[PDB]
C-alpha cells in the first residue's frame, strides 16, 4: 500500500465533472471537509485501468478559474479543497485568461469551464468515458455516503503536510 509518496492530482472531482449521469444533483453539497488520498488512489485506480494518462487528469485538475465564473457556478471550480493563497506579483496581480481563447474571458460562465476542459486534448477516448463511468468507488462511498452509497454515515479525518504545484 501507499505510504512514502502519492499522486499529484485530484481525480475525485475531475471524474465527477466528466460524469454524464445526474450526479450533479448531489454535487450541490459535495464534501466540504476535503478528501484523503486514500480515496483518490481508489477512484483513479479505476480510471487508470481504463487507460488514462497523468498529463490528462492533471490538465483538467490544473484548470484555471475566473472570479466571475465562480459567481455564477460557485462550488464547481477550484476543487473542493484549497486554502493557502499566493498573492504578490511584483509588477501586477494574477489574472485568469486563456491564450487560445480570448473571448472565453468575456464569455458565459458555463462556456468558460467547458472551454478549458475542451482545450485539454491530451485525454484518450477510453479515458474520457472511463472518468464519467468511473462510478463511486467503495472508499468514496464510505466517505461520501450522502452523494454516494446509501448506508454509510461515518468519518474519521486524517491530518498531514503535503502540497505543491503553482504555475503561471
Identify whether the C-beta of residue 132 lies closer than 8 Å to the C-beta of residue 19: yes
CB 139 within 8 A of CB 148: no
Cβ atoms within 10 Å, residue 11: 26
Dist CA 125 CA 152 (whole Å): 33
Q: Which residues contact 39 (CB under 8 A, 6 or more apart)?
A: 12, 137, 139, 140, 143
Kindly provide the b/e burial profile for residues 60-76, where b requires at least 16 CB atoms within 10 angstroms of the residue's own CB. Answer: bbbbbbbeebeeeeeeb
Q: Which residues contact 118 (CB under 8 A, 6 or more apart)?
A: none
Structure solved via: NMR
SS (H, E, C) the chain: CCCCCCCCCCCHHHHHHHCCCCCHHHHCCCCCCCCCHHHHHHHHHHHHHHCCCHHHHHHHHCCCCCHHHHHHCCCCCCCCCCCCCCCCCCCCCCCCCCCCCCHHHHCCHHHHHHHHHHHCCCCCHHHHHHHHCCCCCHHHHHHCCCCCCCCCCCCCCCCCCCCCCCCC
Calculate Rg over the CA atoms of the chain: 17
Give me 76's grid cell: 464547481
CA 128 to chain centre: 14
The rounded distance, in Å, linking the Cα atoms of 109 and 71 is 9
Q: Beta-carbon neighbour count of residue 79 at 10 Å?
A: 16
CA nearest to 64, candidates 26, 24, 97: 97
**61, 10 in Cβ contact below 8 A?**
yes
Nearest CA to 127 among 47, 59, 61? 47
CA distances for 100 relative to 40, 65, 139, 150, angstroms = 31, 15, 38, 43
**Inter-residue contact 81 to 61 (CB < 8 Å):** no
Measure Cα distances from 37 to 26, 99, 100, 146 in Å: 21, 32, 33, 19
Domain residue ranges of the chain, discontinuous segments joined by +: 12-80+95-143
Amino acid at each position: 500500500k501507499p505510504t512514502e509518496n502519492n499522486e499529484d492530482f485530484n481525480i475525485v472531482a475531475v471524474a465527477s465533472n466528466f460524469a454524464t449521469t445526474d450526479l450533479d444533483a448531489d454535487r450541490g453539497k459535495l464534501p466540504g471537509k476535503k478528501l484523503p488520498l486514500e480515496v483518490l488512489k481508489e477512484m483513479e485506480a479505476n480510471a487508470r485501468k481504463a487507460g488514462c494518462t497523468r498529463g490528462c487528469l492533471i490538465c483538467l485538475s490544473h484548470i484555471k478559474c475566473t472570479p466571475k465564473m465562480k459567481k455564477f457556478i460557485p462550488g464547481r471550480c477550484h476543487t473542493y479543497e484549497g486554502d493557502k493563497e499566493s498573492a504578490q506579483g511584483g509588477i501586477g496581480e494574477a489574472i485568469v485568461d486563456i491564450p487560445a481563447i480570448p473571448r472565453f474571458k468575456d464569455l458565459e460562465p458555463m462556456e468558460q469551464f467547458i472551454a478549458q476542459v475542451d482545450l485539454c486534448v491530451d485525454c484518450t477516448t477510453g479515458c474520457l468515458k472511463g472518468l464519467a463511468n468511473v462510478q463511486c468507488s467503495d472508499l468514496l462511498k464510505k466517505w461520501l455516503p450522502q452523494r454516494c452509497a446509501t448506508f454509510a454515515s461515518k468519518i474519521q479525518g486524517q491530518v498531514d503536510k503535503i502540497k505543491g504545484a503553482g504555475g503561471d
